[PDB]
């Protein structure tokens, strides 16, 4: 009900499955979006003749569900967890040039996909009442469809949850500023401008879940020595006294 574009993975060796066409019927029944078929596991074929025949049967059947002449991609195998570059490059141009038809359902209501999830309930309330207590939650993301009214109290549904009312609404600057927008604040896209923003996913090497963050990665003796230090430097200062004069008493703390 929300996917503007869909990439449909079909096991070429095995063929179509229930979970595929059911989405097509659900997509057919809630507003057909742009539908792109990608065929995989084709390297499993041992003969070229059966591969071509299998490709022909699959592409024609994909033309029954989706408009005849629909674009269907074919992927052979996976190397280093990566598909062949060119077929992966070929689909780049298609997705870039796709224009999307106006859908009645999507163009009349506001919707937005949760980029990240955060619970704002005070930890003290979680303890004095217990975990059972209802939780204050903040959900972030980009708005789609018709504009969302600025005044709070708007009624909104969350799939698999129930109906809630918007307690508070505020706009934040863009986490993933598009190139024409970022530089604003026939020419190819500059590779600096290309950006990736994924809060929940691990981008680079850092993954964040709940409030704990996870990352992947003579001097060595000294570092273990520093790490094993117990007393704080401020505490060590307390013990230190200084002689103001050569024969004067050690003065510890100024009154």
């Amino acid at each position: 009900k929300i996917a503007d574009l869909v990439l449909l993975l079909i096991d070429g060796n095995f063929g179509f499955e229930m979970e595929t066409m059911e989405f097509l019927n659900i997509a057919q029944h809630h507003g057909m979006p742009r539908v792109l078929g990608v065929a995989t596991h084709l390297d499993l074929f041992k003969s070229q003749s059966t591969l071509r025949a299998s490709k022909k049967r699959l592409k024609h059947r994909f033309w029954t569900e989706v408009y005849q002449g629909a674009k269907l991609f074919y992927l052979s195998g996976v190397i280093n967890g990566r598909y062949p570059d060119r077929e992966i490059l070929n689909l780049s141009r298609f997705i870039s040039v796709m224009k999307f038809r106006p859908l009645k359902w999507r163009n009349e209501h506001p919707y937005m996909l949760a980029d990240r999830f955060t619970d704002l309930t005070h930890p003290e309330l979680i303890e004095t009442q217990g975990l059972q207590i209802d939780r204050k939650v903040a959900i972030y993301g980009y708005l789609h469809g018709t504009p969302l009214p600025s005044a709070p109290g708007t009624r909104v549904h969350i799939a698999g949850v129930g109906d809630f009312s918007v307690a508070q609404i505020e706009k934040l600057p863009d986490p993933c500023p598009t190139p024409f927008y970022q530089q604003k604040l026939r020419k190819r896209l500059d590779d600096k401008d290309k950006l990736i923003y994924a809060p929940m996913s691990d981008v680079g090497g850092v993954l964040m879940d709940k409030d704990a963050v996870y990352i992947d990665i003579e001097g060595e003796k000294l570092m273990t020595g520093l790490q094993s230090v117990e007393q704080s430097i401020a505490e060590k200062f307390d013990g230190v006294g200084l002689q103001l004069f050569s024969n004067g008493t050690e003065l510890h703390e100024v009154a």
């Binding site: 930890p123 590779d191 850092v206 964040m208 790490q227 430097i233 200062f237 230190v240 200084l242 002689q243």
Partner: protein, 716 residues
Amino acid sequence: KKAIDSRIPSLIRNGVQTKQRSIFVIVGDRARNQLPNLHYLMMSADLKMNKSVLWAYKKKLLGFTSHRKKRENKIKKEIKRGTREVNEMDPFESFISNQNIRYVYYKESEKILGNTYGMCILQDFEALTPNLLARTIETVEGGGIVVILLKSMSSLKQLYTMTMDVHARYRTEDVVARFNERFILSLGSNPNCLVVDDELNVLPLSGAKNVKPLPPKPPKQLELQELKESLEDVQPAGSLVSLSKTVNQAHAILSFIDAISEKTLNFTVALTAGRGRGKSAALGISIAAAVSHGYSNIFVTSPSPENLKTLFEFIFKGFDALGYQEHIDYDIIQSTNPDFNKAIVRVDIKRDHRQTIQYIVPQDHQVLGQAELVVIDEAAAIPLPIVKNLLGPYLVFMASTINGYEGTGRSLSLKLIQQLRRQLREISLDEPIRYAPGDPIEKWLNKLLCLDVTLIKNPRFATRGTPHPSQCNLFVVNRDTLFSYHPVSENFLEKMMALYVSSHYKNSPNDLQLMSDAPAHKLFVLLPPIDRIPDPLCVIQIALEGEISKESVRNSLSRGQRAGGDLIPWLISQQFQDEEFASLSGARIVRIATNPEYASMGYGSRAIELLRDYFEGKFTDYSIKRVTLPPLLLKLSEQPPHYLHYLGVSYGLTQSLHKFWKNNSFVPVYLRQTANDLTGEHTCVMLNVLEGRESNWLVEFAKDFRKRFLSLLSYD
């Protein structure tokens, strides 16, 4: 997937929530690879933070270059050679790839003063200087992160020795680098400082050992939003006050508007604040208010027009708030002089009636007869006689910086206020615009650099009365102890710093390096009679200068960098070309500071007299352990004096100082022809010969200087 120590995510999240900055110290060869992660953690905490990154380095970049096509040209080369995959690009490269990083040298720290950066990364620990610290840390925003990269092995060894025992200080094979050792110990005292390794393990020596995550969410903003809402209908006040970021400067802008409304030409408005508190925004907004009010001839004066760029920018923002449009309502005129770098000089405004804003050199006060308003920015840098001439029968706005750039001593501002006591209106801005008030790092930066130190009147002196000149005896100060960061030594250290700053005209942050690390400098304190931390009454900073420094110089040239210079021997050489004087061992009194309140009773003279006897021999190992602390002060008899031939002074020629040195048996040898631009005074070098040493050469120099002086009365 390792779980990072929970202390680091809590500190970054806390500081963002309270709008406080944070310091991180990363130790390790792979230290650079953690900056991407630490930089990513920023936006996750809060997205609104500034994404621009400041990074300072001395000469070379850690493992890369700051030009793009070379990186792309190289990355193409590894891919084609096959060493790297076609699309492989590490996180450290990714951090540099997409973020806006400003590459800056340590020497050119002046350029970064105005701009605002979310994060500052400091490459080199050894080359750190107070100006490079005060300047860079001030450019970080509230919730920002400061990082210092202690990658050097010698720094790594230095950290080990202090942590194992604070008493022992690691020392390599003449620079002692005590301040850098202070920087380490002080970093521990900061509550919002975490020192970490390349594996993101929080080393325990940090002060931020118990930083706990604060609960989810200021009164300052409430007092500001209400004020803006109340004044929205009242133009031009509403639009101009809307630009205010803070409560105090909004009051200052309102106070300026009141002065503009009063129309009294004998009125004086003095704006005093620290650097980064938004004086220029207040002054620029106030100027825009005068244009809308109806003032025609508006003047602006400063030591150079280049410093006024930030002011004129904020005037135009005020003009935008007031509905003025460029090329229709006003025109901007830029300088044709190459020295001013196309700095804006004049703004002509045509709405209602012809109004003009124009820059003037401070010396050109004769044009001010027609001035309705002059705005004097950075009056601390202008000579006192000149600013007196600038105080004409017209409205005057003054912005003077306390502890900004070179600025001036606090007492000099106080002397200016006493003179004004012409109606005087005083405005003070205390609360910063860039971060939360009372940020630990500013509190921390102040104690390390002692910028915010203030002189205090001592009640016990009043009860006992002022000590007679004869009673006190001079004490030598041990630098290692004074520079150990003990609370007693720090509080003792502050007291000299107060006397250091208050007395004389100009004081740069880098001076605290010069007293600390350089060996030739020795500190003398004129303490009261011993009968509590002793309170200094006069402080003399002297530099050994002559043949004795030559051994140090030769070592410096062996290193490949000449360190410092011998001022007086060089001047006397270029002037008289006397080979003997260079060979002669002598001492230069770099500075002699006395309490302004107790001036004229003779503290300065006796300390010189006691100093003169000490080096004359009339009064006839304290080094810290090198990988329990020795006494803080050493008596004159306890330390042998070095053999000296003369005592020298260098100071701006003034009648009060010249009389003071004339009474102390000092003889003039030279006077600079060109006036120091900031003071307008002529530098003079005066010498005094000690008993038991030849005095013929001074007499010959004195004869020449008079004949030089006599003919040069006319020229300059």
